[PDB]
Amino acid sequence: QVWPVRQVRPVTEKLPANHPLLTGQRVLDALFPCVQGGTTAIPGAFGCGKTVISQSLSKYSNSDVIIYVGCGERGNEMSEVLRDFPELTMEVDGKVESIMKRTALVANTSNMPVAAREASIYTGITLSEYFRDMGYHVSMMADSTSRWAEALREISGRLAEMPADSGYPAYLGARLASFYERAGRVKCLGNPEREGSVSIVGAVSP
Amino acid sequence: QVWPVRQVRPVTEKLPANHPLLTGQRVLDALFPCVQGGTTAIPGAFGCGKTVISQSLSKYSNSDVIIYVGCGERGNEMSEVLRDFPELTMEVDGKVESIMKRTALVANTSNMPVAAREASIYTGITLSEYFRDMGYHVSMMADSTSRWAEALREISGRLAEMPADSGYPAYLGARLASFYERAGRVKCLGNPEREGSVSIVGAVSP
Amino acid sequence: SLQTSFVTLDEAIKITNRRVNAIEHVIIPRIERTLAYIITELDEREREE
Amino acid sequence: VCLFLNLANDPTIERIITPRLALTTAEFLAYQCEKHVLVILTDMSSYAEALREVSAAREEVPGRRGFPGYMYTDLATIYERAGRVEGRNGSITQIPILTMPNDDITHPIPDLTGYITEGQIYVDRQLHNRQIYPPINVLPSLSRLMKSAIGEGMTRKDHADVSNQLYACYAIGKDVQAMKAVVGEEALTSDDLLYLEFLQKFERNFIAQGPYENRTVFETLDIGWQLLRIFPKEMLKRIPQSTLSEFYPR
Amino acid sequence: VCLFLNLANDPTIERIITPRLALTTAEFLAYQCEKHVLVILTDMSSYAEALREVSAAREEVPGRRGFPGYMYTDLATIYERAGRVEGRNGSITQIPILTMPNDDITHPIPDLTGYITEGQIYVDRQLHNRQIYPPINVLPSLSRLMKSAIGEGMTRKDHADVSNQLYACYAIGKDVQAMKAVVGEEALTSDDLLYLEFLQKFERNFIAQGPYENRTVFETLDIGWQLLRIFPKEMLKRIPQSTLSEFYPR
């Protein structure tokens, strides 16, 4: 099927979140826990560990599907995923299965076109909603949404628009809010009663 | 002959500077030596004993030609230089002569046009590059380079140009580096095989 | 009595020097840092207007 | 060697195409003639300043301190032309050189460079004023590809643990050095003096090298262990026990 | 209860008419059906962001931070729809709810809102991080209609003096605690320790309440007196003698 990446896929109802999203870290599990269907932000300077936290979370969490959006970041950080993941496995019925059999990547590195950093984000959150509708629990890692904001500022500059704050357009907060409002636990549209969920973990690069 | 002040004069080759600039003070000649073709900076402030440098350069030095530059000095501070400099003397071949037989002055005050207080440094360096191409060793001195940078900032401001750190124009370090890159020892263009030098002494007022 | 004086004066000297070194190495540098930061941020607000 | 020299009395707007000429030459030599190239780009600060000047010339949206808003997407088209590819036996190792204005690492140039590159080597002024060479401060330094390049069969089994322990000990020593500037020389413990000894011996034996001395990595690791033996093996709380059983007594 | 809901997945330009349909119902109910209405307006900051978003698309001379230059006259046509009118037995009370960006009370939105409303209730982050609920910081909070709603015949004759003395004591205790943390835990005077005990017991017993606890006004005043009894009656300079004589000795 074909779906417009800027329209939210419908549901029957949005339910509250009642289950933990288990990372592998002692902190972030003891002190500041996320839930299945929550929204997280990891702000930090360069060299602090946003990408390592994101990749460990995508390797060892308890989610059924993992979507990894690399939006305007290093191209050697997608070759570390395509090399590490086919070797890591998980146990199900005695049989071992690699964790790349349940992962999808959407890469637009930092020297790729700047206008396709927006189309990347919307491409990921629309794949998180297609699998949630099947009854799965999806987690979506958006690495440096700040690059999406920078793409927006560049395009807004080419249009000769009036800036709002530090150069960014006046509608930045609206885009961010309506993107983070797509995460949650849902009762899925359709007659067989399912229950799905989409968590979003967004890295910020101040 | 007529020469544009914002164009460097051509040479045959830029040599490395390997000969002292004798000033006559025991300090500045033993502990902190300068070379013929070097670049110096002093602090131009009140009551710091600053005239020793220019007076030593003019009277007792191995230079052949002296070029003094005031870049927007106060009104009564210029009246002191234009009074003192025609009084200094040297001894040559046993006789006593006036230093204004081998000296040229560029004199601006704070109310003279802002585009003359900015192009003063370039007039001075072009005169010294003209006397270097004869075979001489020139030593230029720019008094209060800060009063030049402020006229630069004001000329920028007039053209409604985006400011940079502390309001100064964007091209401040480029100008300050391409100015001091005009000093040094060179092998002069032309047939009778000579060699010259230009030594710049700037003054800053932090 | 002289020795008793000596001892109390010796400890009070150390306490006061500790206070001086604290105000000189911990407090004043921090204030100067948060002053330079404010100057920078005001310079940045002007460039947007 | 192939040099592309643009000096300080040369056109400013031609500083924008110099690194791209250099990198096109590098990519031809590496991905078509299959060599190992090393690219040195000197003063990306002057490149960034020429870029700011051209941006201000035509009134575009600025970022911090007047630099264009697209400076990240512009530096990334230069830094990202460096690596290996599948099926070809060449590579490109880039080593830009920066100058941080006022030694500030939060300035737009170092800050945007550190978000793009895979580490950085920090050259310190405080160590230069003590006549130390090379004046490299290892705490604000980083290399993001080290974890996959060291270890058993690559350098030696203990590389990573020695590195992490040297980092921890250096940081605690620099903490003690600043505590003693307030509480005095005679208020420290028996372990704070161990840390203050480690600091001196580290800065003078490990860092300081001499400008023509070529230390194989095993010599470096031996020096690191000689420095770590200052402490009892119970203070080294980052090294596993089966590594301390094999490498600490020797 | 009547609800008007604009969620963060809804259009942004609706937020401009939302607080005006909610205030047109409240005016029909109060001044035509004669009932007492309570209007809650959640995120008066999102409304101003939508205002700025419409003003930036019209290429208008911006205000501070980019918000429109007529944002004062715009918030005043929302806030000033509240009160009682003659001859009609209905009222409207308004409780907007802002969120200050970066906890900054000099941002345009809180600034301009303070010029229009009668006071403010300030929710603090420092009190939140220490497990206090409700985390209300009473030093920058204010209510400008309090003087005429309290006192003898309305609540109790000792209300204003207790409130004034509690405020003054809290201020003096904060100014003490600052330098107590800075210079000397033992250089504190004998009464510069009573203000710190008052700080602790006031933030734990008066402010901290419980998310379902409904105190009367007289219980609040009794707790205020229990706290004021920490100090000898000579240190309460903001309370008259006739009130101290009647309420202190219990």
Question: For this experimental structure, what is the resolution in angstroms?
Answer: 2.9
Can you tell me whether residue B43 is helix, strand or coil?
Answer: strand
How far apart, in whole angstroms, are the C-alpha atoms of residue E143 and residue E148?
11
Question: Out of A162, A169, A173, whose CB is closest to E59?
Answer: A162
End-to-end CA distance of chain D: 45
Beta-carbon contacts of B190 under 8 Å, excluding residues fewer than 6 positions away, are B133
Residues comprising chain E, all counted: 250
**The two three-digit tokens of residue C9, written as one number:** 């004066």
Question: Out of D66, D181, D182, whose CB is closest to C47?
Answer: D66
D132, amino acid identity = I
Would you call the peptide bond into D134 cis, given omega within 30 degrees of 0 as the criterion?
Answer: yes
How far apart, in whole angstroms, are the C-alpha atoms of residue D126 and residue D136?
10
End-to-end CA distance of chain E: 45
Q: How many CA atoms lie within 13 A of C29 on its CB side?
A: 5
DSSP A20: B
How far apart, in whole angstroms, are the C-alpha atoms of residue A143 and residue B126?
55
User: Quick one: which of A157, D109, E62, D124 has its CA closest to B165?
Assistant: D109
E-assigned strands of B31-109?
A: 39-43, 65-70, 89-92, 95-98, 103-106
How far apart, in whole angstroms, are the C-alpha atoms of residue A116 and residue A126?
15
Q: How many CA atoms lie within 13 A of E119 on its CB side?
A: 13
User: Quick one: which of D51, B162, A164 has its CA closest to C43?
Assistant: B162
Cβ atoms of A89 and A97 closer than 8 Å: yes
E-assigned strands of chain A?
A: 13-15, 39-43, 65-71, 89-91, 96-98, 103-108, 137-143, 184-187, 195-204
Q: How many CA atoms lie within 13 A of E168 on its CB side?
A: 13
E172, amino acid identity = I
Angle, CA A136 vertex, CA A135 and CA A138 arms, to 5°? 140
Can you tell me whether residue E21 is helix, strand or coil?
Answer: helix
User: Quick one: which of D126, D155, D154 has its CA closest to D140?
Assistant: D126
Q: Is the dihedral of CA E163, E164, E168, E171 positive or negative?
A: positive
User: How many CB atoms lie under 10 A from the CB of residue D212?
Assistant: 5
How far apart, in whole angstroms, are the C-alpha atoms of residue B119 and residue B106?
11
Best of E53, E61, E67, E109 to disrupt the A interface (most A CBs within 10 Å) is: E53
* Residue A74 C-alpha, separation from nearest chain C C-alpha, in angstroms: 29
How far apart, in whole angstroms, are the C-alpha atoms of residue A34 and residue E181?
36
How far apart, in whole angstroms, are the C-alpha atoms of residue A116 and residue A72?
9
Chain centroid to CA E207: 13
Q: Which residues of D touch A205 (CB under 8 A)?
A: 115
Please, which residues bridge with residue A196 across strands?
A: A186
User: Quick one: which of E83, E71, E60, E136 has its CA closest to E108?
Assistant: E71
Helical H runs in D80-153? 108-114
Please, which residues bridge with residue B43 across strands?
A: B204
Please report, for residues B46, B72, B118, B176, D53, the alpha-carbon distance to residue B148 in angstroms, rounded to integers and kept in the order given.
18, 7, 6, 10, 20
E-A interface (Cβ pairs under 8 Å ≥ 3): yes
Residue in chain D closest to A113 (alpha carbons) equals D73
Residue in chain D closest to C21 (alpha carbons) equals D182
Beta-carbon contacts of D113 under 8 Å, excluding residues fewer than 6 positions away, are D44, D75, D79, D96, D98, D120
Residues comprising chain A, all counted: 206
Angle, CA D144 vertex, CA D141 and CA D146 arms, to 5°? 95
Residues comprising chain C, all counted: 49
Residues comprising chain B, all counted: 206
**The two three-digit tokens of residue D243, written as one number:** 């590594």
Report the relative pairing of strands D119-120 and D91-94 from DSSP bridges.
Answer: unpaired
How far apart, in whole angstroms, are the C-alpha atoms of residue B86 and residue B101?
9
Which region, left, alpha or beta, applies to residue E210 given φ > 0 means left and ψ of -120 to 50 means alpha? left
Cβ atoms of E233 and E204 closer than 8 Å: no
User: Quick one: which of B137, B140, B131 has its CA closest to B196?
Assistant: B137
* C43 CB within 8 Å of a chain B CB: yes
Q: Where does residue B178 rank: exposed (0-12), middle (13-18), buried (19+ CB within 10 A)?
A: middle
User: Quick one: which of A140, A123, A103, A130 has its CA closest to A188?
Assistant: A130
A36, amino acid identity = Q
Which region, left, alpha or beta, applies to residue D184 given φ > 0 means left and ψ of -120 to 50 means alpha? left
Residue in chain B closest to C47 (alpha carbons) equals B163
Please report, for residues C8, C14, C16, D195, E185, the alpha-carbon distance to residue D187 in angstroms, rounded to integers and kept in the order given.
18, 11, 15, 14, 20
User: Annotated binding residue at B95?
Assistant: no
- In the block, which residue shows the tokens 């993107």? A179
User: Quick one: which of E229, E94, E109, E63 has its CA closest to E162?
Assistant: E229
C22, amino acid identity = A
How far apart, in whole angstroms, are the C-alpha atoms of residue A151 and residue A154?
5
Which region, left, alpha or beta, applies to residue A117 given φ > 0 means left and ψ of -120 to 50 means alpha? alpha
DSSP E221-250: HHHHHHHHTTS-TTS-TTS-HHHHHHHS--
Element (H, E) at B203: strand B195-204
Cβ atoms of E136 and E122 closer than 8 Å: yes
* A43 CB within 8 Å of a chain E CB: no
* D203 CB within 8 Å of a chain B CB: no
How far apart, in whole angstroms, are the C-alpha atoms of residue E60 and residue D84?
51
How far apart, in whole angstroms, are the C-alpha atoms of residue D235 and residue D232?
6
Please report, for residues A48, B11, D195, E147, the alpha-carbon distance to residue B20 in angstroms, rounded to integers and kept in the order given.
51, 22, 48, 84
Beta-carbon contacts of C39 under 8 Å, excluding residues fewer than 6 positions away, are none
B/e letters for B45-79, b = 16+ CB within 10 Å, e = fewer, are eeeeeeeebbbbbbeebebbbbbbbbbbbeeeebe
Angle, CA E188 vertex, CA E184 and CA E189 arms, to 5°? 160
Q: Which residues of A touch C43 (CB under 8 A)?
A: none
User: Annotated binding residue at B51?
Assistant: yes
Q: Which residues of E touch A178 (CB under 8 A)?
A: 8-9
Q: Chain D 210-229, CB below 8 Å of chain B: which residues?
A: none
* Residue B36 C-alpha, separation from nearest chain C C-alpha, in angstroms: 40
Please, which residues bridge with residue B92 across strands?
A: B95
Beta-carbon contacts of E244 under 8 Å, excluding residues fewer than 6 positions away, are E233, E236
Beta-carbon contacts of E13 under 8 Å, excluding residues fewer than 6 positions away, are E50, E53, E54
How far apart, in whole angstroms, are the C-alpha atoms of residue B161 and residue D65?
14
Angle, CA A190 vertex, CA A185 and CA A191 arms, to 5°? 115
Phi, psi values for residue E223, rounded to 5°: -65, -35
- In the block, which residue shows the tokens 């009663």? A193
DSSP D91: E
Cβ atoms of D124 and D136 closer than 8 Å: yes
How far apart, in whole angstroms, are the C-alpha atoms of residue A167 and residue E13?
22
Element (H, E) at B204: strand B195-204
E-assigned strands of C1-49?
A: none
- In the block, which residue shows the tokens 């107590």? E180
A167–D63 CB contact, under 8 Å:
yes
Please, which residues bridge with residue B143 across strands?
A: B70
* A161 CB within 8 Å of a chain E CB: yes
Number of domains in chain A: 1
Question: Out of C18, C44, C47, whose CB is closest to D183?
Answer: C18
Q: Which domain holds residue A119?
A: 1-206
E66–A165 CB contact, under 8 Å:
yes
Q: Is the dihedral of CA E109, E114, E115, E118 positive or negative?
A: positive
C43–B162 CB contact, under 8 Å:
no
Helical H runs in chain E? 18-31, 44-56, 71-79, 108-114, 159-182, 194-201, 217-228, 241-247
Phi, psi values for residue A105, rounded to 5°: -110, 145
How far apart, in whole angstroms, are the C-alpha atoms of residue D181 and residue D199?
15
User: Quick one: which of D75, D80, D55 has its CA closest to D65?
Assistant: D55
Please report, for residues A23, A110, A117, E210, E217, the alpha-carbon distance to residue E214 in angstroms, rounded to integers and kept in the order given.
41, 57, 52, 9, 10
B-E interface (Cβ pairs under 8 Å ≥ 3): no
Cβ atoms of D112 and D72 closer than 8 Å: yes
Cβ atoms of E159 and E150 closer than 8 Å: yes
* A20 CB within 8 Å of a chain C CB: no
Report the relative pairing of strands A65-71 and A103-108 from DSSP bridges.
Answer: parallel
User: Quick one: which of D142, D175, D147 has its CA closest to D161?
Assistant: D147
Cβ atoms of E57 and E112 closer than 8 Å: no
D-A interface (Cβ pairs under 8 Å ≥ 3): yes
D185, amino acid identity = E
Which region, left, alpha or beta, applies to residue E142 given φ > 0 means left and ψ of -120 to 50 means alpha? beta
* Residue C32 C-alpha, separation from nearest chain A C-alpha, in angstroms: 23
Residues comprising chain D, all counted: 250
Phi, psi values for residue E216, rounded to 5°: -70, -175
Please, which residues bridge with residue A43 across strands?
A: A204
Beta-carbon contacts of A40 under 8 Å, excluding residues fewer than 6 positions away, are A34, A199, A200, A201, A202
User: Annotated binding residue at D84?
Assistant: no
